[PDB]
Amino acid sequence: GATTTATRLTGWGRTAPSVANVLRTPDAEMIVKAVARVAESGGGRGAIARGLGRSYGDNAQNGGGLVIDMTPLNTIHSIDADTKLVDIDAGVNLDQLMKAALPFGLWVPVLPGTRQVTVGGAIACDIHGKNHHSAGSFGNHVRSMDLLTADGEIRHLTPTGEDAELFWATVGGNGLTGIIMRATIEMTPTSTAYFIADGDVTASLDETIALHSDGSEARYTYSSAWFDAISAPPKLGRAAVSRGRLATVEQLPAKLRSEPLKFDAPQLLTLPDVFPNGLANKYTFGPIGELWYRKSGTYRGKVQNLTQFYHPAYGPAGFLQYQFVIPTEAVDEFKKIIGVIQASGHYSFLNVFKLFGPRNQAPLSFPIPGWNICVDFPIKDGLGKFVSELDRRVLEFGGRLYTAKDSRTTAETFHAMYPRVDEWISVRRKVDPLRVFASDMARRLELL
Numbered sequence: 001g002a003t004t005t006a007t008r009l010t011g012w013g014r015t016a017p018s019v020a021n022v023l024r025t026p027d028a029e030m031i032v033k034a035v036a037r038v039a040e041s042g043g044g045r046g047a048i049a050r051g052l053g054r055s056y057g058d059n060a061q062n063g064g065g066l067v068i069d070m071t072p073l074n075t076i077h078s079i080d081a082d083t084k085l086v087d088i089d090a091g092v093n094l095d096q097l098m099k100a101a102l103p104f105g106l107w108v109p110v111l112p113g114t115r116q117v118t119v120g121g122a123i124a125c126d127i128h129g130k131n132h133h134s135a136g137s138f139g140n141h142v143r144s145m146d147l148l149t150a151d152g153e154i155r156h157l158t159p160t161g162e163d164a165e166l167f168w169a170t171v172g173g174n175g176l177t178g179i180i181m182r183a184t185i186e187m188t189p190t191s192t193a194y195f196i197a198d199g200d201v202t203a204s205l206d207e208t209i210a211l212h213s214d215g216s217e218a219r220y221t222y223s224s225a226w227f228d229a230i231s232a233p234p235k236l237g238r239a240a241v242s243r244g245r246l247a248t249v250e251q252l253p254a255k256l257r258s259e260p261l262k263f264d265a266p267q268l269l270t271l272p273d274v275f276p277n278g279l280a281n282k283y284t285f286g287p288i289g290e291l292w293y294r295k296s297g298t299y300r301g302k303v304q305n306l307t308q309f310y311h312p313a314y315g316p317a318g319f320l321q322y323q324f325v326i327p328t329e330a331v332d333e334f335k336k337i338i339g340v341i342q343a344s345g346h347y348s349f350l351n352v353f354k355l356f357g358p359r360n361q362a363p364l365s366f367p368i369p370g371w372n373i374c375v376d377f378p379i380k381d382g383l384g385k386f387v388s389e390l391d392r393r394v395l396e397f398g399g400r401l402y403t404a405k406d407s408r409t410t411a412e413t414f415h416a417m418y419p420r421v422d423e424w425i426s427v428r429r430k431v432d433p434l435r436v437f438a439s440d441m442a443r444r445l446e447l448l
C-alpha cells in the first residue's frame, strides 16, 4: 500500500525538523516513478532516500521536498554459503541480515553500535564498527549495488569496473548519487556466533594510547574502548578496552557446542531494573572502587555472545552527538583535543574510543587511520560555539567530522575536512545535473 504524506522529519538527535513528502511503498517500480516525476520538474526541490533514521543529523530529510522511506523494501533475495554473498534489498536492516545469515555460518562484515540501520544507510554513510582496523568500513564489502539515478535508470555498480567512480561516490555519498535499491554484500565466514575477548583497564590517556600503540592491536580483529572524558588529568582518558576475535567451535564451552551459531542476547535483565537507584556505594570513588573496576575489566580469553562483547544517556534538553577522527601520527594534538573537552565544562559520560585502520577510496568516506572519538554533550548554554571551536581544532589537526552524526557544522569547515569533496561533487554533477537528489544536509554543507 503506497502512501505519500507530509511528515515532520528529524534525525536521531531529534533536532532541526523539516516537513517533507514521505513516499512509503514496497513497490520498486513506484519508487522509480517518483524519481522520474521529480526529475521531470527539472529538479524541483528534490528527493532523498531514508532508511531507519538512525543518523543524528539532517542527511535523511528534505524540507519542502520528497523523502522516500526505503524500509518496506526489505527482501532478502538470496544467501550463498559457498560464495559468501547476500543479495538484499536496500531496506533490509543489519539485525535482520545477521539473524538470517547465521544459519549459513556468515557474519555481517561490518556492524555499527546499533543493529537498526538499513543496508542503504550502511552504504550511504560507509559505516564503521569495532573491526575497522582489520576489516575496513561497510563500503569495502559491497561487491555490487543497483543505483536508481536522476535519469530514472537503474545503474548496476561494482567496486572495480567502468562505473567504479560512481560506486565510490555512492559509498559515503549520503544518498546524493541516487537511491540504492539492491546490493550484493560479501560476508565474513564464521563457525560461531561468539567472541573470544580480552579486557584491559588503563589508568590514564597516556596509558590508553600506549596500549593501542604497542602492537597488540594487530592481534585482535575487533577493538574499542570506553574512556573517561570528565575526570581531570591524569585520570582523563583512562579506558575500559574491549578487544577480541570471532570464536571457533572448539573454543566454546561444551554446553555451547550444540548450538554454535545460535543467537541469545536477549533478557529483561537490565541494571536499571535490578538496581533502580544506582550501582554506587561507599567504595565506588575510592581506591577499592578503582581496584574493583581494574580487576573486573581485566580478563583473558572470555567467551562472549554478541551483546556482551558488542552491545553493552537521557536528558530533557536533548543531546549533541559529536564524532571525529584525528590522524594516527598527530597523537599530541589528539591528547590536546581531549584536554580541551574535559576543561570545557561540558560533560560526556558515553565515550567511544577506537583506533581506525587504513581508509578506502571513497572520497567522502569518514574513516581515516587514527584516533576515533564519539562524545555525548547534553545540550546547554555555550555548547554550539564550543563545538565550533572543536571543529576548528579537529580540522587543524587533519581530522574530520562524521556526517552520520553531524547536524550543526558549516559548509566551509566540512569542505576543508574533506579535501576530496570537489572530486566527489564533480561526480555528483555528472550523475545528477538537475539536483534531483537533495537533502537538508546537502544544502547546509553545500554538497547540492
Ligand SMILES: Cc1cc2nc3c(=O)[nH]c(=O)nc-3n(C[C@H](O)[C@H](O)[C@H](O)COP(=O)(O)OP(=O)(O)OC[C@H]3O[C@@H](n4cnc5c(N)ncnc54)[C@H](O)[C@@H]3O)c2cc1C
Pocket (backbone or CB within 6 Å): 012, 048, 049, 050, 051, 052, 053, 054, 055, 056, 059, 060, 070, 090, 091, 111, 112, 113, 114, 116, 117, 118, 119, 120, 121, 122, 124, 125, 126, 127, 128, 129, 173, 174, 175, 176, 178, 179, 180, 181, 404, 405
Ligand atoms: C545508537 C546508534 C549507534 C550508532 N553506532 C554507529 C557505529 O558504531 N558506527 C557507525 O559508522 N555509525 C553508527 N551510527 C550511525 C548509523 O550507522 C548511520 O547513521 C546510518 O546511516 C544509519 O542507517 P539508517 O538506515 O538509519 O539510514 P538513515 O539514517 O535513514 O539515512 C542516513 C543516510 O543514508 C542515506 N540512505 C538511506 N537509505 C538509502 C538508500 N536506500 N539509498 C541511498 N541512500 C540511502 C540517506 O540519504 C541519508 O543520507 C549509530 C547510530 C545510532 C543511533
Ligand SMILES: COc1ccc(CNc2nc3cc(C(F)(F)F)ccc3nc2C(=O)O)cc1
Pocket (backbone or CB within 6 Å): 112, 113, 114, 128, 129, 130, 131, 223, 224, 225, 312, 313, 321, 350, 352, 353, 354, 372, 374
Ligand atoms: C544508551 O545506550 C547506548 C549505549 C551505547 C551506544 C553506543 N553507540 C555507538 N557506538 C559506536 C562505536 C564505534 C566504534 F566502536 F568505534 F566502532 C563508533 C561509533 C559509535 N557510535 C555510537 C553512537 O551512539 O552513535 C549507544 C546507545
